[PDB]
Amino acid sequence: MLVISNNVHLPDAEIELTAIRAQGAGGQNVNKVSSAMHLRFDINASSLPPFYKERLLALNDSRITSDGVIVLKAQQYRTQEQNRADALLRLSELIVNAAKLEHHHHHH
């Protein structure tokens, strides 16, 4: 569960955590998995309050989709585990970021 607020919780089911494998391999021949993790969070479908939905949707960030879905790919760290944690922190930071700011995104 992704705790955002005390009375606001994000069920794991509403968070699509994916892992990117090296397509074309994995079933005999070329046996090494890519460290690319994938994050997809349906703001549309999730139980997020209208406030948070609007804050994210009306963001100046290009990782925001018009349908309200957070889609990223963490291919930075050596392990998908660390990229998983990155993505989760990245998501939460982004959510709070849009809330703590007034507008824009390129400004801290």
Short mmCIF file of C-alpha atoms in Angstrom, two decimals:
data_model
loop_
_atom_site.label_atom_id
_atom_site.label_comp_id
_atom_site.label_asym_id
_atom_site.label_seq_id
_atom_site.Cartn_x
_atom_site.Cartn_y
_atom_site.Cartn_z
CA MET A 1 0.00 0.00 0.00
CA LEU A 2 1.25 3.45 -0.90
CA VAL A 3 0.40 5.79 1.96
CA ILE A 4 0.01 9.35 0.69
CA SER A 5 -2.04 10.88 3.47
CA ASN A 6 -3.40 9.52 6.75
CA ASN A 7 -6.91 9.13 5.35
CA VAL A 8 -5.66 8.56 1.81
CA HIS A 9 -4.09 5.25 0.87
CA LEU A 10 -3.15 3.79 -2.50
CA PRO A 11 -3.97 0.07 -2.76
CA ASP A 12 -1.25 -2.04 -4.37
CA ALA A 13 -3.74 -3.34 -6.91
CA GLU A 14 -4.11 0.20 -8.29
CA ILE A 15 -0.37 0.40 -8.85
CA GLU A 16 0.99 -1.39 -11.91
CA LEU A 17 4.60 -2.36 -11.28
CA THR A 18 6.19 -3.96 -14.32
CA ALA A 19 9.64 -5.31 -15.16
CA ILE A 20 11.26 -4.99 -18.57
CA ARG A 21 13.00 -8.10 -19.86
CA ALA A 22 15.32 -8.22 -22.86
CA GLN A 23 12.78 -8.94 -25.58
CA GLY A 24 13.94 -11.60 -28.00
CA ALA A 25 15.76 -13.43 -25.25
CA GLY A 26 15.09 -15.26 -22.00
CA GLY A 27 14.03 -18.58 -23.46
CA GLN A 28 17.32 -20.20 -24.43
CA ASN A 29 20.03 -18.03 -26.02
CA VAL A 30 21.01 -14.71 -24.42
CA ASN A 31 20.29 -15.33 -20.75
CA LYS A 32 20.71 -12.06 -18.93
CA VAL A 33 17.84 -9.90 -17.77
CA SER A 34 17.81 -6.13 -18.19
CA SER A 35 17.73 -3.94 -15.08
CA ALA A 36 14.93 -1.88 -16.64
CA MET A 37 11.95 -1.62 -14.33
CA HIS A 38 8.63 -0.08 -15.34
CA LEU A 39 6.11 1.94 -13.40
CA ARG A 40 2.53 2.54 -14.45
CA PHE A 41 0.09 4.21 -12.07
CA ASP A 42 -3.48 4.81 -13.21
CA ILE A 43 -4.37 8.13 -11.60
CA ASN A 44 -7.57 7.75 -13.58
CA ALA A 45 -8.66 4.50 -11.93
CA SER A 46 -7.01 4.93 -8.52
CA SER A 47 -8.87 6.04 -5.40
CA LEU A 48 -6.98 9.35 -5.37
CA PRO A 49 -9.14 12.34 -4.31
CA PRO A 50 -10.11 14.83 -7.08
CA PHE A 51 -7.64 17.32 -5.60
CA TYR A 52 -4.61 15.10 -6.13
CA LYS A 53 -5.86 14.01 -9.56
CA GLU A 54 -6.16 17.63 -10.72
CA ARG A 55 -2.77 18.57 -9.28
CA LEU A 56 -1.10 15.76 -11.22
CA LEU A 57 -3.11 16.16 -14.42
CA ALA A 58 -2.49 19.92 -14.53
CA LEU A 59 1.24 19.45 -14.01
CA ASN A 60 3.97 20.87 -16.24
CA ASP A 61 5.65 17.48 -16.38
CA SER A 62 5.90 15.36 -19.52
CA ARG A 63 5.57 12.11 -17.57
CA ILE A 64 1.95 13.07 -17.09
CA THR A 65 -0.53 11.69 -19.61
CA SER A 66 -3.85 13.28 -20.60
CA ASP A 67 -5.68 10.17 -19.39
CA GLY A 68 -4.04 10.49 -16.00
CA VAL A 69 -1.55 7.64 -15.99
CA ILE A 70 1.98 7.74 -14.58
CA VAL A 71 4.29 5.85 -16.93
CA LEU A 72 8.03 5.63 -16.36
CA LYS A 73 10.91 3.25 -16.89
CA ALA A 74 13.69 3.01 -14.34
CA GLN A 75 16.74 1.63 -16.11
CA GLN A 76 19.27 3.43 -13.94
CA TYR A 77 20.28 1.09 -11.11
CA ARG A 78 21.99 -2.29 -11.45
CA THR A 79 19.01 -4.16 -10.00
CA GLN A 80 15.30 -3.84 -10.77
CA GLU A 81 14.83 -3.92 -6.99
CA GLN A 82 16.65 -0.61 -6.58
CA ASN A 83 14.85 0.80 -9.63
CA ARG A 84 11.61 -0.39 -8.02
CA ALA A 85 12.41 1.61 -4.90
CA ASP A 86 13.52 4.54 -7.06
CA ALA A 87 10.26 4.49 -9.00
CA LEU A 88 8.23 4.39 -5.78
CA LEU A 89 10.15 7.31 -4.27
CA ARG A 90 10.05 9.04 -7.64
CA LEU A 91 6.27 8.67 -7.79
CA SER A 92 5.69 9.87 -4.25
CA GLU A 93 8.10 12.78 -4.68
CA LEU A 94 6.34 13.76 -7.91
CA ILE A 95 2.91 13.58 -6.24
CA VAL A 96 3.95 15.70 -3.25
CA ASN A 97 5.96 17.92 -5.59
CA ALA A 98 2.84 18.87 -7.54
CA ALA A 99 1.09 19.60 -4.25
CA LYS A 100 3.79 21.65 -2.50
CA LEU A 101 4.40 23.83 -5.53
CA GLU A 102 2.03 26.52 -6.76
CA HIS A 103 2.53 26.06 -10.50
CA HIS A 104 5.13 25.28 -13.20
CA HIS A 105 7.54 22.43 -12.48
CA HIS A 106 10.90 23.82 -13.52
CA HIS A 107 11.34 25.65 -10.21
CA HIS A 108 12.38 24.62 -6.71
#
